Amino acid sequence: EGPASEPDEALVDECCLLPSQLLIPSLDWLPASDGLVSRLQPKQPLRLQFGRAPPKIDHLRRLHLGACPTEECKACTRCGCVTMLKSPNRTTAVKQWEQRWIKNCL
Amino acid sequence: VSVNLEAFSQAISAIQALRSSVSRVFDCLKDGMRNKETLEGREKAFIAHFQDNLHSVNRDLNELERLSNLVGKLYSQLLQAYKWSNKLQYHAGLASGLLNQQSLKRSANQMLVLPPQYVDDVISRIDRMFPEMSIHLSRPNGTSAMLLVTLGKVLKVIVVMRSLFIDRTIVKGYNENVYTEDGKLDIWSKSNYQVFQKVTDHATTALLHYQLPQMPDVVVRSFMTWLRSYIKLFQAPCQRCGKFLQDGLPPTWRDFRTLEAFHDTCR
Ligand SMILES: [Zn+2]
Ligand SMILES: [Zn+2]
Numbered sequence A: 001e002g003p004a005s006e007p008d009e010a011l012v013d014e015c016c017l018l019p020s021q022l023l024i025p026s027l028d029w030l031p032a033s034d035g036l037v038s039r040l041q042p043k044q045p046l047r048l049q050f051g052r053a054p055p056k057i058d059h060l061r062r063l064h065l066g067a068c069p070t071e072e073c074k075a076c077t078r079c080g081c082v083t084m085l086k087s088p089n090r091t092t093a094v095k096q097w098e099q100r101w102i103k104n105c106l
Numbered sequence B: 001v002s003v004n005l006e007a008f009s010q011a012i013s014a015i016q017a018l019r020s021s022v023s024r025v026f027d028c029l030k031d032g033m034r035n036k037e038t039l040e041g042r043e044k045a046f047i048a049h050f051q052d053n054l055h056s057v058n059r060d061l062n063e064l065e066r067l068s069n070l071v072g073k074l075y076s077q078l079l080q081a082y083k084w085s086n087k088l089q090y091h092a093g094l095a096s097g098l099l100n101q102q103s104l105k106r107s108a109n110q111m112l113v114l115p116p117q118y119v120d121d122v123i124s125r126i127d128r129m130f131p132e133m134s135i136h137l138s139r140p141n142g143t144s145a146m147l148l149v150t151l152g153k154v155l156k157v158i159v160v161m162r163s164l165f166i167d168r169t170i171v172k173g174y175n176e177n178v179y180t181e182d183g184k185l186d187i188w189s190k191s192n193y194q195v196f197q198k199v200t201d202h203a204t205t206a207l208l209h210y211q212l213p214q215m216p217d218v219v220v221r222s223f224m225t226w227l228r229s230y231i232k233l234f235q236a237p238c239q240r241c242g243k244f245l246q247d248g249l250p251p252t253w254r255d256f257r258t259l260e261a262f263h264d265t266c267r
Helices: A009-016 B003-031 B039-070 B075-099 B116-128 B194-209 B217-232
Strands: A073-075 A082-084 B133-138 B145-151 B155-162 B165-172
Touching: B003 B039, B116 B133, B116 B217, B133 B217, B145 B217, B155 B217, B165 B194, B165 B217, B194 B217
Parallel strands: none
Antiparallel strands: A073 A082, B133 B145, B145 B155, B155 B165
């Protein structure tokens, strides 16, 4: 309860020896910066035109796509996640997990 | 023999190509399925691209095995010299070949006499190679040179040269008499054969063609080299009409710098 402690050097070195035994495959950052809230500035009006808009992964179910994805997908407005439109496995899938994202994403 | 060097270089290229082909195969298969707009083309394109890489790998392995069947069995500063010397002769060898073709001179002027031993030794130096050629020299009249050149069992050439400059040529067959009644060289006569008259005309054109302005030895060397090609006569057909005979005459024209047989009518 309120540790306020720093890890000892033994832990530091034993985790230093970790990548010599375990490879780190990859990681993906979900909050893709595409909103206009972080781009606008005060007293600086912005003029934007139509259709200008001045390693692809399925973020919901951990499925890798090709260099150029084949099937169309859906993109969240706020978070910006991309997920497959029609899931491939429906007869054998976790219905407690798929039913939680049919309406909206977090 | 130097063929082993080329074989080794080709083997190195083949093994590099094999490694690159394997890497290409695995990378292309890792890339995955593309879009290719409609569905039907998407299906065919991936298979077509996948088959070609494997076929290339098999072809490279097959040609590598074909080569394997074909193949068979202070100092440093010294080597630095050697690898430099052969780097010079080639470097100039191209540079002399490109500047002579594009001659920029317009006139020899700004704003002949040779010792007989010089000509004799030059002609002997020509005679040492081309074992089929045999050359005999004489000077019945003055300082002008009369040379009899026999070629195989086919040709006998009489050449009159004026101070090492070639001036006149007459050729004849083998069985024809070349000497006169007195025993000297017969200069003014004809070969009594149409083909030999045509090749006398060809030799006159050739001597009118090879004309260097200040190197006279290369001129006679080129003339002898051109005359060398005629030994193969009656065994080689024309390169255009296929057949040997055109109007009863065999190919009697040898192109300059590209020594191949041709009929006179075929140019
Ligand atoms: Zn979301
Ligand atoms: Zn012809």
